[PDB]
Homo-oligomer: A and B are copies of this chain.
Amino acid sequence: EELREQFRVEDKDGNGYISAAELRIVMTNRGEPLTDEEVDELHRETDIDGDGQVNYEEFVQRMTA
């Protein structure tokens, strides 16, 4: 579905997680100038279970906002 496809676009190495670096790429491509350190905090906020990675369920939870 559309959420699955968007997750796949943001997951560059295809390991099922969106990393901080992959989130930086997302924000760059959205034309949102964010510093690396700011993206770090956005990544942390998205990482509900605190394993340091954004999985698909966490991506969906944020996209539902």
Residue numbers of A with Cβ under 8 A of B are 13-17, 19-24, 35-41, 43-44, 47, 50-53
Contact A50 B15 (CB under 8 A): yes
Contact pick for A43, options B23, B36, B38, B41, CB 8 Å = B36
Copy number in the complex reads 2
CA distance A51 to B23 in the complex (A): 10
Closest Cβ–Cβ distance, residue A33 to chain B (whole Å): 14
Nearest-neighbour CB distance to chain B for A4, whole angstroms, equals 17
The listed residue (B14, B16, B23, B37) touching A20 by CB distance below 8 A is B37
Indicate whether A24 sits within 8 Å of B53 (C-beta atoms), given known contacts A19-B44, A44-B13. no
Closest B residue to A47 by beta carbon equals B15
